[PDB]
Structure formats: C-alpha cells, structure tokens
Amino acid sequence: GPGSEDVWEILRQAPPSEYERIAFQYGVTDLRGMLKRLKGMRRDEKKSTAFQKKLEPAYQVSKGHKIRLTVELADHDAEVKWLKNGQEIQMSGSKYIFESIGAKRTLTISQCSLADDAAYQCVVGGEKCSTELFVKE
C-alpha cells in the first residue's frame, strides 16, 4: 500500500479467527467493533412500517369484473393516497369505492376495464406499494 493502514481490506478478506491477531498487527483493537457494527448492518429491517398490509405485486382481473385491492395501515385513522400510474384515483361514482374497515382500506373497483389496467399505488408517508393490475379482456 502507499502508506496506509490497509488493515480494513486485509481483515475483510482474512480468516475470522485471525481477526484479532491481524488487527493488533496493524494497531487496531476494534476488529470487534467492525464486526459488531456489521451485525447491526445486516440486521433485518423488514419494510411495511406504517403499512400493515401492502398491495400484492400484481392482481389479475377479468374485464368487466369487479376487483378490490387491500391495504392495511398500522394506524386506524391514518389514510392512504390512491394513485394510479401517478394520478390520484378519485371515487368515480360507484366505480371506485374506498372501504375502510378500521385500519384496513379496501379499494373496490367496480367493472374493471382496460382503462383501470394500471399500477395502483397506495401511498402513506414512508410506505407505498405499487400493485399492477392486469385486466384480462
């Protein structure tokens, strides 16, 4: 190396039992530290924080058939934003019905057409899910 410690890449590629030997060889005593922080690094952070149920990857519906999407929030009084491909899904008559059963927001879409065939995003701040409806005609 040019004149560096190098110990980082060296320990990174070193056998696990030899970490302390190699660390102290380069002056490092916190090999344990690099390990412990990495345990927090690989520490699972499952998503769906404000969501209790996110939309499925996709949904298939028959054209002229009613389908409904289901999202659950982690809070009862919190609301979702409804976007289809980037446009706010508004309740058009009895075609788009937001049924909120507690924290569970179920969007029932009556008579899905090819115009309904779009990606739906239920956006909560920090949590959104984009499901893609496939309307089979």
UniProtKB/Swiss-Prot annotation:
Report the PTM annotation.
Answer: Substrate for phosphorylation by PKA and PKC. Reversible phosphorylation appears to modulate contraction. Polyubiquitinated.
Domain called Ig-like C2-type: residue spans: 48-137
This protein's source sits in the domain of life called Eukaryota
Q: List the disulfide bonds.
A: C122-C129
| Positions carrying Phosphoserine | S113
Record function comment: Thick filament-associated protein located in the crossbridge region of vertebrate striated muscle a bands. In vitro it binds MHC, F-actin and native thin filaments, and modifies the activity of actin-activated myosin ATPase. It may modulate muscle contraction or may play a more structural role.
Disease association reads:
Cardiomyopathy, familial hypertrophic, 4: A hereditary heart disorder characterized by ventricular hypertrophy, which is usually asymmetric and often involves the interventricular septum. The symptoms include dyspnea, syncope, collapse, palpitations, and chest pain. They can be readily provoked by exercise. The disorder has inter- and intrafamilial variability ranging from benign to malignant forms with high risk of cardiac failure and sudden cardiac death. Cardiomyopathy, dilated, 1MM: A disorder characterized by ventricular dilation and impaired systolic function, resulting in congestive heart failure and arrhythmia. Patients are at risk of premature death.
Q: Which family does it belong to?
A: Belongs to the immunoglobulin superfamily. MyBP family.
Q: What is this protein called?
A: Myosin-binding protein C, cardiac-type
The organism named in the record is: Homo sapiens
Name the encoding gene, please: MYBPC3
